[PDB]
């Protein structure tokens, strides 16, 4: 048993995204694009909110995960993911952040918010499989029947050594054997550096 096995596949996660206090305009823009990756996420303006008051309210309302976005000198620098009610908590540093407007050939127009497929590539260690489990359960489960044939959106995590490249695309199945991708963004590199067994205070 682990923190996910009881409810995995039975309930949709309920995710909250927020930022450190006094966020830069760049951090706010990043937080909206992060929110858009997660179809059952809400985003809460940080305001003057004290983090223990925020965590307790999210616990009270039975949210399942919090995603907290940190920055330094105007650049997003870390991501904290904590699973409720009792853990675990993953922290990773952020690098090579590129917002949708700065991605050549990124889609323009509205992004359909269907439940995405996920791709995890290259997580060949117990540590890697632990990170996959934490990330995977931030997205709702999908219907298994004809899953391999339906959908139009995918979030992709590619692990090389200790870093994870993250991408977000919509796609059109143009034929039985061909697909066109349109990148939604953001792009970024995530480097996990802490996994603790509990939650935030």
């Amino acid at each position: 048993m682990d923190e996910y096995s009881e409810l995995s596949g039975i309930v949709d996660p309920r995710v909250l995204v927020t930022t450190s206090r006094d966020p830069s305009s760049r951090l706010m823009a990043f937080s909206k694009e992060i929110r858009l990756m997660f179809p059952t996420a809400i985003r809460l303006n940080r305001g003057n909110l004290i983090l223990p008051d925020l965590v307790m309210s999210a616990q009270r309302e039975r949210l399942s995960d919090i995603i907290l976005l940190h920055e330094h000198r105007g650049t997003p620098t870390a991501i904290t993911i904590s699973h409720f009610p009792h853990g675990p908590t993953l922290m990773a540093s952020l690098h090579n952040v590129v917002l949708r407007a700065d991605i050549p050939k990124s889609i323009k127009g509205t992004v359909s918010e269907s439940y995405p497929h996920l791709i995890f590539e290259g997580f060949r260690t117990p540590l890697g499989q632990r990170v996959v489990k934490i990330l995977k359960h931030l997205f709702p489960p999908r219907d298994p029947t004809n899953n391999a044939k339906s959908g139009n959106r995918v979030i992709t995590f590619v692990n090389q050594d200790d870093c994870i490249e993250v991408r977000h695309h919509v796609y059109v199945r143009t034929n039985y054997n061909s697909v066109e991708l349109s990148e939604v963004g953001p792009r970024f590199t995530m480097r996990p550096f802490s996994i603790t067994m509990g939650t935030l205070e």
Binding site: I119, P126, L127, F139, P144, I195
Partner: protein, 80 residues
């Protein structure tokens, strides 16, 4: 007098041991039971390279491969 000093020294030793144990857990889990305790790593002496256009292009080829082969990793629904 000399034994309150020893209390603080042992406090420092315990704190250093806790750090060491959390780092060894990270190192061990990243080699290929092993996932039950706090783990951390200080990557201090490593920069993170820029992502070349070649790498982003191969990620696109990976994604098309997975879509056309139906090889997806999300959780699937079940009955309780």
């Amino acid at each position: 007098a000399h034994e309150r000093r020893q209390a603080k020294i042992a406090e420092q030793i315990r704190k250093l041991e806790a750090e060491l144990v959390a780092k060894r857990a990270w190192t061990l889990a990243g080699e290929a039971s092993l996932l039950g305790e706090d783990m951390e790593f200080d990557h201090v002496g490593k920069p993170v390279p820029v992502v070349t256009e070649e790498v982003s292009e191969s990620i696109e080829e990976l994604i098309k491969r997975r879509i056309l082969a139906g090889e997806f990793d999300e959780v699937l629904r079940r009955r309780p």
